[PDB]
Ligand binder design. Structure first.
Ligand SMILES: Nc1ncnc2c1ncn2[C@@H]1O[C@H](COP(=O)(O)OP(=O)(O)O)[C@@H](O)[C@H]1O
Length: 412
DNA sequence: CAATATCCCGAGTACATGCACAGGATGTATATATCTGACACGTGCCTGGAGACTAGGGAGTAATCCCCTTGGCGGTTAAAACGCGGGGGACAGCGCGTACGTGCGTTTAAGCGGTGCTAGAGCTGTCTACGACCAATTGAGCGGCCTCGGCA
């Protein structure tokens, strides 16, 4: 039976939890598309004690017009396909986050910040995100990095130079990232235009067509439960669906999702039987052709990037296949990935598949551990004055960050 | 002549209508405007006129029986009228849509310069289609040979 989600927690703090040693403790801000995750670096403690503000990245303002609201509670959100592209709907998302974390007082946030961004970020987008940050909030110095690569940095066996493929899958994108000597080989990195949002959207539209008698009973927040709790990824889809074909297996494995009641009441207050549907929603990232979409999918793409290298460095970078982010949470994901990988390697060769320690939070914990180390490496950060000579389309090439290129944007 | 029916006249009957009222949105009122197109001017075409001639058609007639037209036909139901059934008719309320208002932002119109699409050109330059004629076919009717039924 379905549950309902929680809302409106009580995060309130003093003006700044400044510890011993250096006073400018940075904010660690994972600016996610599904949800934002934000908090103080809190140095000198091994386990990250409190990743506060776990909240959905969505805002309310309706037919009333005169007000808007920002916490977990018609709706809007600041992103287009995992790049932020909104003005004040970004501000009132930052404002919520700062106010609930506490801030000093004066006409700026006194603390430096580390902020996640898109695997590639359009130059205009980076420029705007820098302007909307330095101008309005007055931050002293800033760092941009990629969610996935922070999660890798967290999960590495050692704080040392590495190579691998990162497999990442968030709200509206999945990416395959080849990395060599700690550097993202962004020349031949690739992404797929699908993700967990689109899975839920498909599972919704399926069950709407299965039970037209009660369109209103099924809605995204209930699709979330069946997709998180009750769905799994096949080892081989055309074989799973084949064992699902016989009634004696079906009845033993179909999921009985009881709606809340007011004929045994199921003619409207149905038990929403999900069978094959609990496979067809996860599978979208491996076979986007279950939707209309003609793209290679996470299987053909991995082969298509992996055959663009010399045969020795393939055998190097496949030694660390890493799973992180959103959709990798499905049960069975490691097994499907390592089976699909076994067919596309030399007959006796070796590979290894690692799953992130906490697939959803390790991006933030990574950004924490990174900033807490690189406090004083002033070649890594963008300082407030640099933004006055370099127009905002500028970045500092540390590991776990997008590849910079010399370029400039006309503005007046 | 009797009977069912339509017509006609006066009592008694809700509300419909015509009115008065407040007030609001728009019709007026003035000044300005360019430009539609009025008007004026020739250009050049066809609408018309005007002849000579054949041949196609039209008009006429003649004969006539097909078709219409009529009477009288025989056969069966729409109408008449009644009994008889249920169904169209008159109140209580829910809330869903429609409207309407707000702020939603998509697109068009305009004016910009460049340029290639189309629509008037040809004797284009032929040659599909247009007569012109020939040939095949079927069908129908008229002679001609031959078994049999009713009559000497
Ligand atoms: N436990 C889970 N099982 C399955 N899917 C999950 C789970 N938790 C989150 N998701 C999916 O993860 C996606 C969001 O992941 P996230 O890393 O926050 O995205 P991003 O970094 O792009 O904002 C959502 O589409 C959601 O459906």
């Amino acid at each position: 039976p379905f549950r309902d989600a929680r809302a409106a927690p009580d995060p309130v703090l003093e003006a700044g939890p400044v510890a011993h040693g250096p006073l400018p403790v940075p904010l660690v801000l994972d600016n996610g598309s599904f949800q934002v995750r934000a908090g103080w670096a809190c140095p000198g403690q091994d386990p990250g004690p409190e990743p506060r503000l776990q909240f959905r990245a969505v805002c309310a303002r309706g037919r009333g017009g005169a007000r808007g609201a920002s916490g977990p509670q018609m709706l809007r959100s600041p992103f287009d396909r995992n790049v932020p592209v909104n003005l004040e709907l970004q501000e009132l998302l930052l404002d919520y986050s700062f106010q609930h974390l506490g801030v000093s007082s004066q006409g700026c946030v006194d603390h430096p910040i580390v902020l996640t961004e898109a695997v590639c970020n359009p130059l205009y987008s980076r420029q705007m995100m820098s302007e909307l940050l330095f101008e309005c909030y007055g931050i002293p110095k800033v760092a941009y990095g990629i969610d996935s690569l922070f999660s890798f940095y967290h999960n590495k066996p050692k704080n040392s130079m590495c190579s691998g493929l990162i497999i990442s899958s968030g709200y509206q994108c999945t990416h395959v990232l080849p990395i060599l000597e700690g550097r993202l080989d962004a020349k031949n990195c690739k992404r797929i235009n699908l993700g967990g949002s689109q899975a839920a959207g498909y599972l919704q539209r399926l069950l709407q067509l299965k039970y037209p008698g009660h369109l209103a009973a099924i809605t995204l927040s209930r699709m979330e439960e069946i997709l998180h709790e009750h769905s799994y990824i096949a080892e081989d889809y055309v074989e799973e669906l084949h064992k699902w074909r016989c009634p004696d297996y079906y009845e033993n494995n179909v999921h009985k999702m009881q709606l809340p009641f007011s004929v045994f009441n199921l003619a409207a207050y149905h038990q929403l039987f999900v069978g094959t549907e609990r496979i067809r929603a996860p599978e979208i990232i491996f076979q986007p052709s279950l939707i209309g979409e003609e793209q290679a999918g996470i299987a053909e793409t991995l082969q298509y990037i992996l055959d663009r290298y010399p045969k020795d460095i393939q055998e190097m970078l496949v030694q660390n296949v890493f799973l992180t982010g959103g959709n990798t949470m499905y049960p069975g994901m490691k097994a499907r990935m390592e089976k699909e990988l076994l067919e596309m390697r030399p007959f006796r060769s070796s590979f290894q598949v690692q799953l992130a320690s906490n697939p959803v939070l390790d991006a933030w914990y990574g950004a924490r551990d990174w900033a807490l180390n690189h406090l004083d490496d002033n070649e890594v950060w963008i300082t407030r004055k640099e933004y006055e000579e370099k127009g905002g389309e500028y970045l500092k090439e540390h590991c776990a960050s997008n590849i910079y290129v010399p370029i400039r944007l006309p503005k007046q």
